[PDB]
Amino acid sequence: SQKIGHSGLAFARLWHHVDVARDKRTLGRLASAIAITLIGRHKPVYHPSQDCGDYVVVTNCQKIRVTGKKFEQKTYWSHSGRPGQLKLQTMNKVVADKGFGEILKKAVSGMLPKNKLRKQRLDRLKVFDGSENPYKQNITAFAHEQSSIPEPLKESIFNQLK
Template identity: 50%
Template sequence: MKTYRVRPEDVQRNWWLIDAEGKTLGRLASQIARLLRGKHKPYYQPDVDCGDFVVVVNADKIRVTGKKLEQKIYYRHSNYPGGLKAYTLRWMLENKPEEVIRLAVKRMLPKNRLGHRMMKRLKVLRGPEHPYVAQKPQKLEVEA
């Protein structure tokens, strides 16, 4: 029996729609990362980009457990001396909820060119409407 190697041009890409309302941040991010990598497909290969497109709506209505709203801190640096900025999760959810989900998923993907390509297929939106109706994304229920 010969080993089957999938080629990038043979990959079938689907569109998935995930509603983040009431979902826990980490559990949601791991499911999204799984779809972006293509691990749900029978022909998954770690070195081939075989993932799907994922559209996440209602990013501002995600849930976190414990004391993470005050204790989890996101850092940014402007590359100038003294340019380190720190933001709590509460501030990020009020001002940039899309960025919270995007960063959680990004840190679960490979840290190379393949991971950057996968991140381009993630679309995170604050409200319930999305502009990807023409692609006919399939609704996916994720465990809370």
């Protein structure tokens, strides 16, 4: 009886935004939160046989928080398959070569279930080092929360793009 009704809104791939400049969680703990919202556990309509994930946009990744000395000690491995060609890159090298978004993407990828939906769930995670992203308008906005935003700033974000 509870299932009968308009179910379209429930299965809507909303877009969430996390600003690492304001968020105070570390890399691992933030990754765990991002994985849960990508899997869809936050939705009461979730079933393991369905991909109910929601797009997650992460900005200002350069202010990520890594504790200890992992930034220069943690090693990322990638083996082609031939003996003697194992590559061990430290986190410092990876971010300098690809970016801070890849650290989050790598962390989230492990959290995701090892299913056929892993790759589809990972691409839903968009990570940007800075604040400039093409998905600025692709976020959950509400009428009752536009009072705080000044009009000149609002117009710049909407019309003035790229």
